[PDB]
């Protein structure tokens, strides 16, 4: 219950510049020297990765031309943010490349810096199907109407007369999403990525059929890959911290939440053949006395 | 020329199936899925 | 000790021409439709090489 005052960086600067939460100090002794010191054990606590949060930032403009844009844009938000069973493919690792020339005939070489490059994100979402197959229809009809249609390679929405030109630009049929890795307390954001130009790519939903009456019915899982252009930096971290400043947890308490039933059903009260009924009506109430 | 051949009011995913019903010979055979329910299986009713 | 008279083909005709033994009728209700029927289980016997 007492740490070294220098365990935590007093202010975030240099390589910690732009960080949000508390950053541990590196210039305090570690455990892998001559011997470890028990006076600095509060500084050995390790980092553990937490799940990523997805925020919808933009909607395709094609939703507007539909008969109901509200439900298209609400369903997309719910699928991105709530129904997402898993997310994957997010990577922005660096890459350094050198060139070589021998420093004599012995075998040694001199290495000179050449270039630095960065990775590319390939978002993958996964969902679990529900009654009525809303997910399969949502994505299939999205592709069919707002993207190419296989037998003509033309969007099926253009069958309406009045769609404006400039419908081939990404703003018509693409959206954007912001991904945030939060703190264990979920108050500060440690990693972030702002991907845009996102729309389905490659294989669509499953869409296979079969007959076997002796087998057991099985579920359906949706796997979807997307496209994207990503930005990383400090402005994106500030954007993520602004996002996570919202969604505050002050006040809530799961232990103190009310139960989802306030009281027994009315039909149950009309049966009079339970535990409480025997006490209320069946047993004689003569009273207790000396 | 391209202005003609307009696509207004067209949808290739809402077009009717090229078949509207099963052939008149299929119905005559009276041995299959619907036939078993219609004539083969007993129909006593459902009483709980 | 009883089975439907239509279980065995009355005559070996059409695609069963030249057959020597008794050939089961494929027009008898089968098990893999809506439900299996116990009245036609005599016709469900298998072929073994």
Q: What are phi and psi of A113, to 5 degrees?
A: -65, 140
Contacts of B28 in chain C (CB under 8 A): none
Rg (CA), chain C: 12
Write the residue in B6, B8, B12 that is nearest to A152 by C-beta. B12
B38 vs chain A: nearest CA distance in angstroms? 21
Q: Are B22 and A173 in contact (CB under 8 A)?
A: no
d(CA A178, CA A88): 14
Q: Considering only alpha carbons, which residue of chain B is nearest residue A150?
A: B12
Q: What are phi and psi of A156, to 5 degrees?
A: -75, -15
Cα distance between the two ends of chain A: 59
In this complex, which chains have at least 3 CB pairs below 8 Å with chain A? B
Contacts of C43 in chain B (CB under 8 A): none
Resolution of the experimental model, in Å, one decimal: 3.0
User: In whole angstroms, how far apart are CA C40 and each of C4, C5, C30, C34?
Assistant: 7, 11, 8, 14
Map residue A237 onto helix, strand or coil: helix
Q: Are A157 and A62 in contact (CB under 8 A)?
A: yes
Tell me the torsion sign for CA atoms C12, C15, C21, C23: negative
d(CA A223, CA A203): 9
C12 vs chain B: nearest CA distance in angstroms? 20
Tell me how far the alpha carbon of residue A166 is from its chain's centroid. Answer: 32
User: In whole angstroms, how far apart are CA C22 and each of A232, B8, C16, C42, C43?
Assistant: 79, 63, 10, 13, 12
C19 vs chain B: nearest CA distance in angstroms? 24
Which helix (H) or strand (E) segment is A126 a member of?
A: strand A124-128
Chain B to chain C, count of Cβ pairs less than 8 Å apart? 16
Do C34 and B31 make contact, defined as CB atoms within 8 angstroms?
Answer: no
d(CA A12, CA A215): 60
d(CA A196, CA A65): 21
Q: Considering only alpha carbons, which residue of chain A is nearest residue B9?
A: A159
Beta pairing class for A53-58 and A86-88: unpaired
Query: For residue C32, is it left (φ>0), alpha (ψ between -120 and 50) or beta?
Result: alpha
Q: What are phi and psi of A86, to 5 degrees?
A: -150, 160
d(CA A13, CA A140): 49
3-state SS, one letter per residue, for A21-41: CCCECCCCCCCCCCCCCHHHC
* Alpha helices for chain A (secondary structure H): 62-65, 69-81, 134-146, 170-173, 235-245, 266-269, 275-277
Which one, of A249, A248, A242, A250, lies nearest residue A57 by Cα? A242
The single residue listed with the structure tokens 């055979």 is: B29
- DSSP states along A80-113: HHTS--EEE-----EEEEEEEEESSSSS-EEEEE
A160 vs chain B: nearest CA distance in angstroms? 5
- A139's tokens: 């994505």
Map residue A73 onto helix, strand or coil: helix
Contacts of B36 in chain C (CB under 8 A): 29, 33-35, 37
Q: Considering only alpha carbons, which residue of chain C is nearest residue B37?
A: C34
What residues of chain B, 9 to 28, have a C-beta less than 8 Å from chain C?
A: none
- DSSP states along A159-183: GSTT--S--SSHHHH-EEEEEEEE-
Query: What number of CA atoms fall less than 13 Å from residue A213's CA on the CB side?
Result: 6
Sheet holding A229-231, edge to edge: A53-58, A175-182, A189-198, A229-231
C5 lies within 8 A of chain B by CB? no
User: In whole angstroms, how far apart are CA A109 and each of A105, A106, A198?
Assistant: 9, 9, 45
B35 vs chain C: nearest CA distance in angstroms? 10
* Alpha helices for chain C (secondary structure H): none
Q: What are phi and psi of A77, to 5 degrees?
A: -60, -45
Do C29 and B41 make contact, defined as CB atoms within 8 angstroms?
Answer: no
Q: Considering only alpha carbons, which residue of chain B is nearest residue A149?
A: B12
Q: Are A64 and A97 in contact (CB under 8 A)?
A: no
């Amino acid at each position: 219950a007492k740490k070294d005052p220098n365990t935590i960086m007093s202010a975030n600067s240099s390589y910690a510049n732009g960080a949000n939460g508390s950053v541990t100090n590196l210039e305090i002794p570690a455990a892998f020297g001559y011997t470890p010191d028990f006076r600095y054990y509060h500084a050995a606590a390790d980092y553990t990765r937490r799940p990523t949060i997805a925020f919808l930032m933009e909607l395709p403009n094609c939703f507007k031309d539909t008969d109901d844009a509200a439900k298209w844009g609400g369903s997309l938000k719910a699928l991105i943010e709530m129904h997402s069973r898993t997310i994957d493919g997010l990577d922005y690792t660096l890459e350094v490349e050198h060139v070589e020339t021998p420093f004599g005939g012995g075998g040694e070489m001199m290495q000179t810096l050449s270039k630095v490059r960065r990775a590319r994100s390939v978002p993958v979402f996964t969902w679990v199907e529900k009654i009525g197959m809303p997910v399969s229809r949502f994505w299939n009809n999205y592709i069919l109407y707002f993207m190419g249609e296989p037998n003509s390679n033309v969007a099926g929405i253009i069958g309406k007369g009045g769609i404006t030109p400039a419908a081939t630009y990404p703003d018509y049929n693409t959206f954007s999403v912001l991904f945030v890795e939060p703190d264990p307390t979920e108050r500060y954001a440690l990693r972030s990525t702002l991907i845009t130009n996102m729309q389905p790519t490659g294989q669509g939903p499953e869409m296979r059929m079969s007959k076997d009456q002796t087998s057991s019915p099985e579920q359906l899982q949706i796997s979807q890959t997307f496209t994207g252009l990503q930005m990383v930096g400090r402005g994106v971290d500030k954007l993520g911290q602004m996002m996570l400043d919202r969604a505050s947890q002050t006040g809530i308490d799961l232990n103190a939440q009310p139960a989802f039933l306030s009281d027994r059903e009315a039909d149950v009260a009309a049966r009079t053949d339970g535990y409480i009924d025997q006490l209320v009506s069946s047993l004689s109430k003569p009273g207790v006395a000396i």
